Design a protein around this ligand. Structure first.
Ligand code: TSJ
Length: 192
């Protein structure tokens, strides 16, 4: 199992997301969302909010345990290792983004790390605020790299159908989609 840097993704994006068109662009969304969905499936968090921001970036927020805020080796945060070393989905999104921010809430603290220009960290994982102890979760916002994708326009209907399906499969978890470009919004939630 050979590890690689993010440059490897940027030179062969098709090998990781299939293509650099609309399909590839939306694969980025699926990778980020599936991380939140996997957490909910494990029983952590009961809503997942997706937002297409007006500047074209996309946000996904869950309310699960929150990614580990501890240190890996050499003072490098565990979360930074996940976002910068290719083994998988998260580092691929980071590599193919002109910028990305991850915000973790847990243990009464809020932490943030920002990456730019293909996943280069411009900050470390720093505490930016506090919260109630009961508050937990992970939020990731990324801007897809326009120098790589032939289109960086997220399609509301495409994402809506995917989130609907993920909601039907998950059960008892609310998934929302909000389009700040057009004010459109919808929510999905299935019982059992
Ligand atoms: C939207 C989003 C959510 C998440 C994420 C990850 C978590 N949780 C874990 O990574 C997790 C939490 C706790 C424990 C533990 O053993 O206590 C383990 C893991 C893997 N929740 N949400 C991760 C990402 C990711 F992968 F960074 F892109 C994106």
């Amino acid at each position: 199992q050979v590890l690689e840097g993010l440059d490897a993704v940027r030179k062969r994006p098709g090998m990781y997301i299939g293509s650099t068109d609309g399909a590839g662009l939306h694969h980025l969304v699926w990778e980020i969302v599936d991380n939140a969905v996997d957490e909910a499936l494990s029983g952590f968090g009961d809503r997942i909010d997706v937002t297409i921001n007006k500047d074209g970036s996309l946000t996904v927020q869950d309310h699960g345990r929150g990614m580990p805020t501890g240190m890996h080796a050499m003072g490098i945060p565990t979360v930074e290792v996940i976002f910068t070393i290719l083994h998988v989905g998260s580092s691929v999104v980071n590599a193919l983004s002109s910028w990305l921010e991850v915000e973790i809430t847990r243990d009464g603290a809020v932490y943030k790390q920002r990456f730019e220009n293909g996943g280069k960290p411009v900050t470390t994982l720093k505490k930016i605020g506090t919260a109630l102890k009961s508050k937990t979760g992970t939020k990731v916002t990324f801007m897809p790299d326009a120098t790589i994708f032939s289109t960086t326009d997220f399609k509301y209907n495409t994402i809506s159908e995917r989130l609907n399906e993920s909601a039907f499969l998950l059960k008892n978890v609310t998934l929302s989609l909000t389009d700040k470009r057009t004010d459109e919004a919808i929510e999905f939630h299935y019982e059992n």
